[PDB]
Amino acid sequence: RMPEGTTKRVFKGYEEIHVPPPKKRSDPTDQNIPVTELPEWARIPFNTTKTLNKIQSKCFPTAFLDDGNMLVCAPTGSGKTNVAMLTMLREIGKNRNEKGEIDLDAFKIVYIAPLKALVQEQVGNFGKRLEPYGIKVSELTGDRQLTKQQISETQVIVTTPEKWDVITRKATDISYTNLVRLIIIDEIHLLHDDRGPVLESIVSRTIRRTEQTGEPVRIIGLSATLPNYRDVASFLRVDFEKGLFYFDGSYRPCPLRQEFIGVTDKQLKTMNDITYQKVLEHVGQNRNQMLIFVHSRKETAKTAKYIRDKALEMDTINQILKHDAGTREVLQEAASSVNNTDLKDLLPYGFGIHHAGMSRADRTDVEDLFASGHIQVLVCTATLAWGVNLPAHTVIIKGTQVYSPEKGSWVELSPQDVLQMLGRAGRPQYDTYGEGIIITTQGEIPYYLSLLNQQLPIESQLVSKLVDSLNAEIVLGNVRNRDEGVEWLGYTYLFVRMLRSPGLYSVGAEYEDDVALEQKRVDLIHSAAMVLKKSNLIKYDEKTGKMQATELGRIASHYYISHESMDTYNKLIHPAMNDVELFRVFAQSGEFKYIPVRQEEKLELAKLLARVPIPVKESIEEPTAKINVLLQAYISRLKLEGLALMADMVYVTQSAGRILRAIFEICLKKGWASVAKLALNMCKMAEKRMWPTMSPLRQYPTCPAEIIKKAERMDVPWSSYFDLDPPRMGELLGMPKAGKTVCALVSKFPRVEIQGNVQPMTRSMLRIELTITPNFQWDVELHGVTESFWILVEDCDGEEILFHDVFILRKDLAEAEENEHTVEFTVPISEPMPPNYFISVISDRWMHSETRMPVSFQKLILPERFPPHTELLDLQPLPVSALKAKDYAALYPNWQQFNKIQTQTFNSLYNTDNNVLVAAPTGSGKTVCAEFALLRHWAKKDAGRAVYIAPFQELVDLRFQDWQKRLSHLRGGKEIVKLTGETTTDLKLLEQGDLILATPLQWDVLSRQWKRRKNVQTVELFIADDLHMLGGQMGYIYEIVVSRMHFIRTQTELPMRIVGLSVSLANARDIGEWIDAKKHDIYNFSPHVRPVPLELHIQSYTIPHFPSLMLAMAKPTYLAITQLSPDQPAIVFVPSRKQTRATARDLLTACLADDDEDRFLHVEVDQIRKLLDHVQEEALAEALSHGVGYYHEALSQSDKRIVKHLYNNGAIQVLIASRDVCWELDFTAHLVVVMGTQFFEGKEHRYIDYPLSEVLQMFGKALQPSKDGRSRGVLMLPAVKREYYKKFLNEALPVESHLHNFLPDAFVTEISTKMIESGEDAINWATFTYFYRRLLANPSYYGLQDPTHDGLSQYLSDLVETTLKQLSDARIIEMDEDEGTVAPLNAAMIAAYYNISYMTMEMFLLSLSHKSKLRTILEIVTAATEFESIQTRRHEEGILKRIYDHVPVKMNNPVWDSAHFKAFVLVQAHFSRMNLPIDLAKDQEVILQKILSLLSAIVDILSSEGHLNALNAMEMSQMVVQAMWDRDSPLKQIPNFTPEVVKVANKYGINDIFDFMEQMNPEENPNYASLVKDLGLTQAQLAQAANFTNNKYPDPAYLKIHIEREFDPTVHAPFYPGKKSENWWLVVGEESTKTLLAIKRVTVELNVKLEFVFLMSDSYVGVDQD
């Protein structure tokens, strides 16, 4: 190895090696130098120069048109940044297209730079140059997840490699990580350094994901001229003949002269004297300014002082100090007056200093003076070379020994440092050439010679960090087995560098016949994984190769902790650990083992050990004790004099944050409250640089040290600083001047009040509702947009953690009017009850920010002990013959015998008429239990009416579909029916039908007037299926109707049997006695008696970002399907209907990653294409074409039918359903995945947990057995919920009543029917409720505190009186102080009629008490509470806003994330006939379903108040049925009548539809040949027009009446989902009087009179006469 230049010159002690600067050699004229005549865009960044150099010339074609990866290798200071700029502009042009700049959320781009200085400089440059495009450039920094999350909301992200690697390792930003499309890697020769492995990790994982998924991510790399560049090219997966570029020194815009000097291998003043001589030569004779590079903040000033002193003596300051008046005066004045940093008074001599320890203003002044020419010699550090654009003619790198504390020794400079330093040599437009000198030793000259002459190979250093990096890939789920590990390792720089030089990497030569070093990659991974197995970071099945990450491995990856350090932490941490032992554990980290104790620093160390508070039991002058006291002294803010000691301390403190956070999370996951809180406090000590015993004001940067000093000289407790004003603040602090200052600081200190509500669920688990209220003024400068907190729940002893979570407080929600947040969790409890628990809310970053709360159990009453389940008797299986009738036995031809649940319940269901309750797991046969009662009922020739009830319309619909087909041909007639919703139509079905299926609300509506309707009294059989769902939402009406049926059979002595079905109950005695069942008729079977046993796997996840968690669960579900149910169907439930499509895509991409795209397809696509063409949703058609398909509420009926056909016939194997249709889903699988147990609720701005009944219902679909005879489920939840959902999946389901929370809406219906005329009537009614029977069993769940009859009666009295008070303060009920009497007003009548909430009713009456206009009723209707039950999808703002700007009527105060605003906008969208996306259109459908009922209610309200504007509201009813405004012309009702056609007809003088049909031309006018041709409609469209125009369009003593007609009541309304009948309103009056007449809702030759103390159609526009 001896390549070099031309000349050597030996001297007394040094050896000058001079390499000539190469000529430009621009003889090849093929160099284009492209003129900036690009398109209008991509020209705005290039403003400072109108021409591109030769390198950007050669790179432009593939950088601006092609998309492939790219590698450029240019000399130092060449102009490579603009190549990356070209690629950025191409990616920009990809998104914004079609003469219009489009959204920036469609793409992101990352720029990876080696050091922070270059990161910030590039942030500035790219921000300035891309600001006209509107895009934001941001630096990824802060080390806090809440600021990095906000930073990742920008497109151009500049970052260091370690920061990007740790961001991707945490995997809590993948939703935006997937948006990146281009990655720029600057100075890739860092791969040779010890930091190269992080770049290898980044590039390998990115390229592997892009190659296995197809989603392209462009990679552009900028590097220097070093050998092995084609190696890093192939590692970057670049085409050599398309995107590889290598430019020699001849392409440098300003050629550099290299000069190497080395002192003889005494005296180190030789380097300083040589620098002084070279300063004399270049600044004196050549008159060139120059900069020198040293590697210390103090050594730079030392060398500058030495040069200036040696120039002072010997009268040599001349030739250096400019002598003109201007430069001298400017230097003198600027230095003496403006600058503040000491040792900077070298400026009057023309000298300048620069390093990171100076002010930003001082550095900018130095930069401006050097650029202006006033500074000739500038001594500086590497931060200048990395972060400023300040070039000089001459650059001297003085010294090559730099201290590395991580290695604890003096090492040589890194190649990237010297290359960046020499990049500043030679000005491009001032001088012809540049000069770069390196001053080193004699034994290190060949190293830098090879470095600068392209002879320093770039070798991989991944092995030293393999075990760690592999672990990361496992924690990400990208490496689950040996083969995936080898696939990952094949995308690293180590792999290609091993393929080229096997002997140099000691492969061992055993792998001679090893293709692609495959056997070398397993042997290299099996070892690494083995280590990970022994440190307990990974679970590694040696045989099957499968690997999985443990929580320790996840913590190690998230915090960049070595496996050795993790081993030490896990082995050393114990729950009783104090601060001393925690510091000792910190000091035993492997990241610091190479730091030795030195006698040179024996004194200071001792001086430091006496000033640090924490005792150091470790032996003095031991490396661990050294770094311990280093951390402590850093926290103590102590100045240090030792240089290497200062470097060691800087290193220790840079690592301290990660190490202490890892310690904290270790203590947290093991559930040790004391040491967890201590470790969190230590994290705060290190990150804020303060002990807990000092003033918390130290956390504020802008707080003057005088105030801190004063406060720490005081004894005032910190809590006494709060709840004051500036006067009292200054008075309390003894310093009036500061009164306003610190008052503004403590007011911004994160403060939170908390409240707790405890509800016992069982004797071993409580449910806690925690209300958190912000009590501090927000400030973005020191808070950001979100503040993180920890919720901890500790024992009475404070020893273990019973619950912990993160609470993220957003700025928008914190400073809101109603800013209260809620958190609902569960904690266990032992039967000897502890006196109390503790709840702490502790800031994650701020010290002394903690709100603590006792949770006392002295008043808590645990519910009654659960009794044993009814045992499953091992009886002889009952044959079907036991039915005693072939008629009934024909109904069950598939099975010879019933299962043991049906045989054990057979006698009491089929041979007796007693009330029965059967509780069994889902999928056990309970429908047969109901059919037993049905068959006995129909055996009796009386054959009374039976009523089946199910909680949801989907369940009654499936039940009807089955029973109307199976149970039709029977003894007499079938006539089984299902109700519709309106009383008059289903009452005829009740009179007509023998078996009436209904929902709780449908049966409620007609069972209210049971006294006047004998058909409700004569009901002999009543089956309440899914009775436990009374605890589900809208389940209180179920409880109401069951209690009312019992009351009915108790009033009328007629016999009435009740049969209840539910899942396995924890408390079945109360439900059984509720329906008056005998002890022997209450079958509450164990939750394990399901005929097909269920294997249940639970998987925990810790990902605070919801889209990231949802993406993270995708591949585990693929693995669960492929391994647990490979050849059997599978169903996967997701939290949202929009999540079904996303999860379908994620699963399909996981299939692509496994090199099997159609893995879940089992039929040729050509056989399925016939049906695939029929699907409406394109995403569903694609997923089905690859064999997945999904199912959600927004799917059309045909799409559901196609999905069901394809799934049942085995064509597709997987099915992804939303949790919103878990009851409707008429499907069955061998495996059921529950991917997530949370859904976002718009009201509370938070995620709610799945009801347990929902998880039971979803796992009840797992009924197809394997050869094992068992079904399989996997439940994927957050970790904090695991023990909850486990608890109530292996134990029965507890059911409580929420009727006490909906008593107003129940009393509305009760009092409206005079069923409750007084408060004692209300108490008597309540006695019939399950709530009442459950007050004695679990009183603390309902707020009751005295279990005696006195306390119970007092509780009921308080409850009914408060409910009647709520209904009386609202203008609904009539009740006063005289007696507890209540009377229903006209409001309660229509409230119970139209089935609207009482809150909606109150706000209706309040906003309508004054006669309002139509534009006001539009705002009032959409504010109803019924619409608040509609889901809000995240990030749908803007769409609603974009369509709200295209809308005539608007509200004064809009809330863009409210259901009110959504309904308000969507109703007007319906009116304007605007296209809507799928989910928004389904929401609009849901709106329109109820808006008509709400409008009729408002009509009745305004008629009750007697105001005229009632006649306005009914007009609204037309507008929604016909989807048009009141201003619009009638002609828009005709089909295919675009407003263009409306104006074409208006030109022909057509205003009404009557004028349209009268002006048709069979024989009327010759306008046909003109009008038809002007309308542009085809004969089919004209026929469809004639259809509507001819077939469906219409044509106090007393008051006379006279009516006539021109029919089918069916209304033609293509835009209204459902059916309507043509009603009419009749009322008249006077306009000036502002009073209305009585109005009667006329039906369809009907003469109706009117008592006087228009004909208003509800669905058409040709409405009224005058």
Ligand SMILES: Nc1ncnc2c1ncn2[C@@H]1O[C@H](COP(=O)(O)OP(=O)(O)OP(O)(O)=S)[C@@H](O)[C@H]1O
């Ligand atoms: N076409 C151009 N016309 C004028 N100046 C240019 C042009 N291209 C680049 N430069 C300037 O050349 C200097 C160096 O280019 P950069 O790409 O920013 O740095 P560099 O090439 O990466 O140097 P290093 O030390 O290797 S990082 C900058 O000051 C640019 O503004």
Ligand SMILES: Nc1ncnc2c1ncn2[C@@H]1O[C@H](COP(=O)(O)OP(=O)(O)OP(O)(O)=S)[C@@H](O)[C@H]1O
């Ligand atoms: N003895 C039996 N042998 C085999 N299959 C049966 C038997 N009894 C019922 N099944 C079937 O097994 C499935 C169980 O569904 P069901 O038990 O009727 O519903 P459920 O478990 O009571 O809960 P629901 O329907 O949500 S109220 C149905 O497909 C039945 O047809």
Ligand SMILES: Nc1ncnc2c1ncn2[C@@H]1O[C@H](COP(=O)(O)OP(=O)(O)OP(O)(O)=S)[C@@H](O)[C@H]1O
């Ligand atoms: N741990 C938490 N504590 C409190 N509120 C939370 C928490 N997680 C989520 N939220 C709330 O739920 C909302 C939705 O959060 P996520 O969808 O998980 O992520 P995100 O914060 O919205 O990030 P974006 O909006 O996608 S950039 C947040 O805006 C919060 O209001």
Ligand SMILES: [Mn+2]
């Ligand atoms: Mn660069």
Ligand SMILES: [Mn+2]
């Ligand atoms: Mn059932």
Ligand SMILES: [Mn+2]
């Ligand atoms: Mn396809």
